[PDB]
Structure formats: structure tokens, C-alpha cells
Design a protein around this ligand. Structure first.
Ligand SMILES: Oc1cc(F)ccc1CNc1ncccc1-c1ccon1
Lengths: 245, 245
């Protein structure tokens, strides 16, 4: 009795964990610029995910070893009584890699820890990764980075969400934060608790795509449009309806 | 007045063109196997897209020059009186590339022809690419290929749809056709004219992911699961409601 309107079962005791890895500064010998504004992104994401019932765990400027430890820890704890898992990266990236403070890490080995094989308690539950990462460039200025992180899929019941697609540019206001994360957080506030999550991400695609880039204080930043995307491997409608205490 | 339920305007005179590039056989010196069953994929897609009002144009085993000519032709004709554009590749692929009969072509240069810049008549209209392409290995049998084609995004208002994700395997029955395209076509038949198209593709993710791979006639084909994905850069809900004559 196959159902075209099947929703992920979101009636477990807890919503689940939202990891946020937040990277502002980098080891000198990496020659990567400060990401002034990333704290606004971390704080905005933390508030909006908290209001949808996530236990939000933030980590600032972890070295590779510490990041792998924290994310492995979370992968081997039980999610049996959880709706889903969210993991956010705010850093620089290149290709299949995100930057820790120290060094780059393959995204596939981070997403791999939550695959059915390796994390039984999350099988058939949504695993959502959100990635604001681009190429390290060099009061409220708008900085623009070229897209650099591949828009990779991840496995059954993963949703990979990307600030920017190949050939487009990602924008970060040094006080207000990343265009992508501002618009994501605005949509989570207005609609997080009602709209299907891919419907919401589609709103975010519209909001960010519509941001005008013809009249810029920096001339070289003109016509550098931003288009985000998501790569869905979801098998059901995903909603974050308020949980009944 | 920003609207969370905005639909793409799908009330133009014609639905639009669906290109289908169908590749069964390859130049000897490419050492690529026949794709026995791809004709079932072509015929199934042709029927289901026709019933949703597409002018379906099929091309069998085009050399690179011919394919570039046909797709450039379609890109420079006017889509002003059209709802959208669909383009399907049934071939082998590797990374950035789809195989013509002759040689490989960068997917970015095919999707590039329909970007706002280069095709004014499709600006703000959905551009949907469906790609059944994997790595060619050196009565109704099930053949299994490793995933090989990158799940690339494409630009504002593109939807890129992929038979299989990194690390998974794509299946083709030599009479019935590709698992992905069978399940896509079944869902188009039941739900094409009612469901939002990304909702439908999510059904296809469930159907294909749920196909069992533990009891196979070939032992070496066991545990080779298939998970499709889509990379959405859509900005609105997309529906293929019946057109009013
Ligand atoms: O999507 C982007 C985004 C960028 F910023 C830059 C480039 C691509 C295209 N690459 C891929 N996309 C998806 C899965 C794999 C790749 C891949 C792997 C090895 O080379 N490419």
C-alpha cells in the first residue's frame, strides 16, 4: 500500500543533534583569510535550529584531530530516540574538502560516519549537511568568494545543502554574515515549523538568486551572482512540525 | 508580497521540448559495451513526457558533432511560448562527461547553452536534465555499472536528475530497461500530472533505494545498492498539471 505523501516519522522523544563547525581563523601556514561574519552565521543557525527542537552543539576553530574526534563521538552515540541529524560546516573548502583550522578533511569521511552501515540508529532518518564553504580569497563590507566545494550527494536519506554552485560566487557581510545563511535562517524563522524542508530550501534558492549584484561598492564584485543548490537523496517528505511536550 | 507557495508559470501555449539522446552502441575503438535495454528507457520516457504535453524529440547514437548541432539548434530556437525544457542522456559517462557514439562531451557545455545568458526565452523557466549514465565494464539479464558521472548542479532554475550517486551502482534489465528510468516512468504515469516534480523524484529515490540486491542470480552483484539523487537549483514549485486545449 505505497503512499505518495509518506512523511519521515518525526514523533521520536528528541528532534536530534545539530553539529555546527564554525571556522573564522586558520593556521598561519595555510595562507587562508579570516571569515569575518561567520559568528553571525553560527548564532543565527544556532537560534533557528534550537527553536525547531535541536540540541545544537557549536565548535569554534577545531584542529582536524579534534573535529574528527567530536564528529566520530556523535556518530557512535545512539540516535535511536531522535528524529534526525543536522551537521553544518562554516569554513573554507576546495573540491571534496572542508578546512579545519589545521588542514583539510574529505567531506565523504564526515558524511560516511552516518551511513546506514556505520550508524544503525539513523537508518531511514534524515541526515542533513549544510555547507557554507568557498575559496580563501586574498564597517559591514560584503566579501565575495568563488564557488570551490563540489555539490556532492551522500547516500540514502542524506540531504546535502550548498551555499553556492559551480561558476557562481558566495557572499559574506562582515557583520550580518553569509547571504545563504541569512536567507536560510529567515526562511527557518518564517516557515521552518510548517513547510517541507526541500520546499523551504527552494525558497532559499529564490531569495539568494534574486539578490542584486549590478550596483556594488567594489566594481570587481559586479555580475558575480549567487545560486545555491541542494542534492537530495531523501525518500520521504521532511517536516519539522512542533514536537508535543 | 513574497509567497512561499509560488509555482513556475506553466500556462504558456506549449509545454516545451524534451530532447532524448539515446546511446546503445559505440565506436569500436572506445571499448564501451552495448547498453541492451536503453530502447525501453527511450520509449518509456517518450510516452510519459508526451502524455505531460512535451514535444519529444529522440536521437539514436549521434556522433559528437551531430549531437552538438542538434542541441545548439534547440538552444537558439525560441522557447518564448513554452513552459520549460527537458533534456535526457541515456549513455555511458565519466566525471564531467557523457558519451556520444564517437567521443565524450562536457555536460557543462550542454547545460551552458540553456543558461539565462545564452537562451533568453528560458530565463525563469525550469530546465530539467535527466542523466542515466555510468561506467561501461569491459533473456532479460540485470547488468550493473558503477556510478561514474558527477552529480553536478547547473544554474538558476535548472534541476539535474541522476540515476545513481557516488559509491552506489546503476542497474539495467536488458529488456525492461534501467531501474531508475522504470521507476521514474512509473511515477510519471501515476503522479506526473498532480505531484510537484521534486516530490515525484523523491518517490523515485524511495522506489529505487528499496529495490533488493541480496538475492541475485549473479553472486558478484550482491549488496550493490542503487540510490539516485537530484541537484535542485529551482526557485519555485514545479507542476505539470494538464494543459487546457
Ligand atoms: O559542483 C561543483 C562545485 C564547484 F564549486 C566546483 C566544481 C563542481 C563540479 N564537480 C563535482 N560536483 C559534484 C560531484 C563531484 C564533482 C567532482 C569530483 C571531482 O571533480 N568534480
Amino acid at each position: 500500500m505505497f503512499d505518495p505523501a509518506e512523511k519521515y516519522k518525526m514523533d521520536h522523544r528528541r528532534r536530534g543533534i545539530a553539529l555546527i563547525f564554525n571556522h573564522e581563523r586558520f593556521f598561519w601556514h595555510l595562507t587562508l583569510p579570516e571569515r569575518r561574519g561567520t559568528c553571525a552565521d553560527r548564532d543565527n543557525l544556532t537560534r533557528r535550529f534550537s527553536d525547531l527542537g535541536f540540541e545544537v552543539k557549536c565548535f569554534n576553530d577545531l584542529k582536524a584531530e579534534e573535529l574528527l574526534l567530536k564528529i566520530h563521538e556523535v556518530s557512535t552515540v545512539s540516535h535511536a530516540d531522535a528524529d534526525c541529524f543536522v551537521c553544518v560546516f562554516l569554513s573554507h573548502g576546495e573540491g571534496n574538502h572542508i578546512y579545519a583550522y589545521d588542514a583539510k578533511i574529505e567531506i565523504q569521511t564526515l558524511t560516511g560516519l552516518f551511513k546506514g552501515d556505520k550508524c544503525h540508529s539513523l537508518v531511514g532518518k534524515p541526515k542533513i549537511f549544510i555547507i557554507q564553504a568557498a575559496r580563501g580569497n586574498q564597517t559591514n563590507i560584503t566579501e565575495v568568494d568563488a564557488a570551490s566545494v563540489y555539490t556532492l550527494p551522500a547516500g540514502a536519506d542524506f540531504l546535502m545543502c550548498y551555499s553556492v554552485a559551480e561558476g557562481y560566487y558566495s557572499h559574506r557581510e562582515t557583520v550580518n554574515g553569509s547571504w545563504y545563511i541569512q536567507d536560510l535562517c529567515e526562511m527557518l524563522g518564517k516557515y521552518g515549523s510548517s513547510l517541507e524542508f526541500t520546499e523551504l530550501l527552494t525558497l532559499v534558492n529564490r531569495k539568494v538568486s534574486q539578490r542584486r549584484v549590478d550596483f556594488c561598492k567594489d566594481p570587481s564584485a559586479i555580475g558575480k551572482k549567487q545560486v545555491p543548490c541542494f542534492a537530495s537523496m531523501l525518500t520521504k517528505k521532511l517536516h519539522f512540525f512542533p514536537k508535543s511536550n
